[PDB]
């Protein structure tokens, strides 16, 4: 899931109904990410890879065309990259802020069994009065029926 | 053989060298058919079917323009249609003069043996001092070699 999808409960239920076990939480780097990813870990019983970006001088000098714009953009806060376990606790060192790096962890998918034990909202930890509709039908604006490939009459055939 | 081909000895020898047995002697109607055909029967030891045509008034009206031409063409003598044995003697009735008819005979190819006994110029009845050259190769003015059909480009193909 991407950024603020972690603060949309129906997205969490859509992932939980499909029995997710390892989850990638990609964030851009300006919106708060620690709490949302940790809660997703706890409430979905998943290992969470929280990945975030950093800012570069080339970016700042490409988009900040005015001193006011530059000063406003320089106040943007930094994201973090870390890996959490099914209990929301980190299982790796946080990459130093505003630096390039990769976080590593050992993922034992068997650990999720110890947390399905006492919570699984899409399974046993549910009430009959609250349910969710998950419509997976393709929803393009225009539906192509019997797609074809156009015939071409090459110049040589015509002459 | 046709008409005066029976009076050319080399044609008799060409037929004999191929061991002819039953001979069709075609004649037009004006030239003496009797002697040549009977001699052919004897000399080639063959049964000879002598066939001749007759004149009609439609032919005379077509080709005679003057009266002198008609009178001159009225003197042409008739042919004869008869069959002979390998001894030159008739084996069927001569058809009536200047009438349409068919002569029938019983041909016994076995009868030619008894006259091959007497004479066979292409075989035993020959002398080493005389010989014939029978050139059986084709003699066309233009020899067509590798006659092959060329392709044709149709209108639709060009279009």
DSSP string, B61-128: HHH--SHHHHHHHHTPPP---EEE-TTS-BSSPPPPTTS---------GGGHHHHHTT--TTTTS--T
The resolution in angstroms reads: 2.8
Tokens in use for B97? 């003069």
Residue whose token pair is 């008894």: B114
For residues B76 and B30, the answer to whether their CB atoms sit within 8 Å is yes
Helix axes of B9-17 and B34-44: crossing angle, nearest 10 degrees: 40
Distance CA A65, CA A70 (A): 7
Contacts for A141 with CB less than 8 Å, ≥ 6 apart: none
Distance CA A45, CA A16 (A): 9
Strand order in the sheet with A22-26: A22-26, A47-51, A82-84
Q: How far is A156 from chain B (nearest CA, A)?
A: 9
Distance CA A57, CA A78 (A): 14
Residue B158: closest C-alpha in chain A: A159
Tokens in use for A71? 């000063």
Tokens in use for B21? 């047995």
Contacts for A127 with CB less than 8 Å, ≥ 6 apart: none
For residue B159, the chain A residues in CB contact (below 8 A) are: 158-159
Q: How far is B153 from chain A (nearest CA, A)?
A: 13
For residues B90 and B83, the answer to whether their CB atoms sit within 8 Å is yes
The number of residues in chain A equals 159
Q: How far is B152 from chain A (nearest CA, A)?
A: 17
Distance CA B55, CA B125 (A): 41
Contacts for B25 with CB less than 8 Å, ≥ 6 apart: B1, B6, B33, B36, B37, B40, B48, B49, B50, B51
Give the number of beta-carbon pairs within 8 Å between A and B. Answer: 3
> What residues of A are in the B interface, CB distance below 8 Å?
158-159
For residue A155, the chain B residues in CB contact (below 8 A) are: none
Distance CA B26, CA B2 (A): 5
Give the method of determination.
cryo-EM
For residues B12 and B44, the answer to whether their CB atoms sit within 8 Å is yes
For residue A159, the chain B residues in CB contact (below 8 A) are: 158-159
> What residues of B are in the A interface, CB distance below 8 Å?
158-159
Name the 3-class secondary structure at B1: coil
Residue A156: closest C-alpha in chain B: B159
């Amino acid at each position: 899931l991407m950024c603020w999808e972690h603060q949309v409960p129906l997205d969490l239920m859509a992932m939980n109904a499909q029995n997710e076990q390892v989850h990638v939480a990609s964030w851009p780097g300006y919106f708060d990410d620690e709490i949302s990813s940790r809660y997703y870990a706890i409430a979905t019983q998943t290992f969470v890879l929280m990945t975030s970006s950093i800012y570069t001088e080339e970016m700042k000098e490409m988009i900040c065309l005015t001193q006011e714009q530059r000063d406003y953009f320089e106040t943007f806060k930094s994201g973090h990259t870390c890996i959490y376990g099914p209990d929301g606790e980190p299982i790796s060192d946080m990459v130093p802020a505003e630096t390039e790096g990769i976080a590593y962890a050992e993922i034992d998918v068997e650990r999720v069994i110890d947390y399905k034990y006492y919570i699984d909202p899409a399974g046993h930890y549910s009430n009959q009065s609250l349910s969710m509709n998950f419509n997976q039908q393709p929803t393009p604006v225009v539906k192509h029926l019997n797609h074809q490939k156009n015939e071409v009459f090459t110049y040589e055939d015509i002459q």
